[PDB]
């Protein structure tokens, strides 16, 4: 679940924030939102940053249409596979 | 879960956005919100678009009172039936 969390966070942070000098915020922002996503959050007005209903209308640019797909695959893997692998674990 | 997701998304998008020329956004918007709904999101200030507490006071019009019902049935089917069909699957 932390390999799935960087599989999504490193592309999401690269695809969306491409003018990043080296920083420690590149250590949070590849781990931060993909962790809270597991716990009910979706950041719905940050998915599809080029949409009109965006809290991030400045993150729009080349390649940012990939992140709704990455995140779709992410949460499917988190909730529908890995969280139910915990539940199944805790049951048995 | 993707038949339930278009069973809700195609009516929700037709009942609410009825002046739609053909577009590729009719390929996202019938699949987009009903997927994030599965993962904690409800879009609470977009249900009942004619309510006062609406992020969508312009989507109000004839027939939009149907979507709180469609969505009620949707999530009942997603969470309370299909997500617990996954959990039950992953257990056994
Ligand atoms: C292989 C296993 C099976 C996979 C299943 C299928 C996989 C998914 C298939 C989805 C169908 C294809 C959808 C995109 C179509 C083109 C979009 C487009 O042209 O523009 C869109 C751009 O926005 C995007 O391109 C973002 C990507 C869409 C969301 C991805 C799906 C995630 C949720 C669902 C995942 C599961 C759904 C389940 C399906 C029932 C919107 O239009 P625009 O105007 O260009 O943008 C606004 C910009 N503006 C404000 C500046 C104007
Ligand atoms: C499934 C049931 C639903 C319907 C199905 C029918 C599908 C028909 C779809 C057809 C796709 C083609 C339409 C888009 C091209 C036109 C231009 C366009 O909008 O470009 C967009 C590129 O966005 C994309 O390229 C979207 C993703 C393309 C793949 C579609 C899903 C593949 C099938 C599923 C499997 C995939 C894997 C999923 C995981 C397993 C960019 O537009 P924007 O984002 O608005 O950015 C604009 C702002 N900017 C200029 C600053 C950048
Ligand atoms: C067979 C199995 C049984 C199923 C169960 C029962 C089914 C549900 C039964 C529901 C009772 C009926 C409710 C609607 C009553 C009429 C509403 C009305 O006239 O006005 C309302 C309009 O808003 C709507 O019409 C939206 C529809 C109602 C919400 C849907 C319920 C979903 C959640 C519950 C689902 C779980 C139910 C749990 C039950 C305990 C509000 O007033 P207004 O002022 O017109 O609106 C503001 C507009 N204005 C700003 C322009 C003024
Ligand atoms: C359960 C316990 C709770 C209470 C029970 C008692 C129930 C009493 C209910 C009575 C309903 C009649 C009252 C409304 C009629 C007056 C006019 C009106 O306000 O119309 C509204 C339409 O809203 C509707 O038509 C509401 C939905 C009708 C069905 C109600 C549930 C049936 C029982 C459950 C089975 C259903 C299936 C459920 C799923 C299995 C329009 O108002 P608006 O929406 O604000 O939009 C107006 C704005 N506009 C002009 C721009 C358009
Ligand atoms: C059965 C289903 C199979 C489908 C599978 C998917 C196949 C299709 C895959 C990908 C479709 C690629 C085309 C969509 C982008 C067009 C829009 C665009 O250019 O947007 C932006 C840039 O976008 C880019 O710069 C993206 C460049 C192409 C893709 C880059 C690699 C990612 C895909 C890797 C492969 C992933 C494969 C995944 C396989 C699972 C900007 O828009 P513009 O128009 O350039 O200019 C601005 C707008 N204006 C001019 C109006 C002002
Ligand atoms: C035991 C329980 C069983 C109950 C079952 C449900 C039975 C009840 C069924 C239906 C209730 C229909 C009446 C409610 C709407 C009235 C308000 C209205 O007209 O709103 C708007 C339009 O609304 C429309 O154009 C809707 C037209 C009728 C319904 C269309 C088919 C959908 C239901 C299919 C059947 C579903 C069957 C589902 C069965 C599971 C506009 O408002 P107005 O008033 O036109 O004028 C403007 C407002 N003003 C004048 C104040 C300025
Ligand atoms: C197996 C896993 C693969 C992924 C991963 O773990 C192991 O690989 C690690 C490598 C790390 C980076 C290494 C070096 C730096 C330079 C630093 O520069 C300070 C500059 C300035 C600040 O202003 C000082 O003043 C910023 C941080 C950064 C980019 C790391 C970020 C986290 C990264 C990407 C880690 C990531 C979680
Ligand atoms: C069994 C399932 C039943 C539901 C469903 O899957 C199979 O049936 C599919 C039919 C698809 C539409 C067919 C043709 C077009 C025309 C196109 O026109 C470009 C216009 C312009 C852009 O501005 C060009 O420049 C836009 C897309 C649209 C409306 C499709 C959307 C997705 C739909 C609704 C699919 C939906 C998920
Ligand atoms: Ca939740």
- CA A73 to centroid of ligand 1, rounded, Å: 13
List A residues 32-51 in contact with B (Cβ-Cβ < 8 A): 37, 39-42, 44, 47-48
**Rg for chain B, CA atoms, rounded:** 14
Only one residue has tokens 């890995």, namely A82
Measured distance CA(B69)–CA(B67) in Å, rounded: 5
- Cβ(A74)–Cβ(A80) under 8 Å? no
Mutation pick from A36, A44, A85 vs chain B, by most beta carbons of B within 10 Å, is: A44
What is the C-alpha to C-alpha distance for residues B86 and B81, in angstroms, rounded to an integer?
9
Resolution given for this structure, in angstroms? 2.9
The dihedral built from the CA positions of residue A74, A78, A79 and A81, taken in this order, carries a sign that is: positive
Method: cryo-EM
Closest to B33 (Cα-Cα) out of A79, A51, A30: A51
């Amino acid at each position: 679940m932390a390999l799935v969390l960087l599989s999504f966070g490193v592309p999401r942070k690269a695809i969306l924030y491409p003018h990043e000098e080296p920083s420690w915020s590149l250590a949070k922002d590849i781990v931060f939102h993909p962790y809270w996503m597991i716990f009910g959050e979706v950041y719905a007005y940050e998915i599809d940053v080029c949409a009109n209903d965006s809290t991030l209308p400045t993150i729009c640019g080349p390649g940012t249409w990939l992140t709704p797909f990455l995140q779709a695959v992410y949460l499917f893997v988190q909730y529908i596979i890995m969280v139910n692998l915990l539940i199944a674990f805790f049951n048995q």
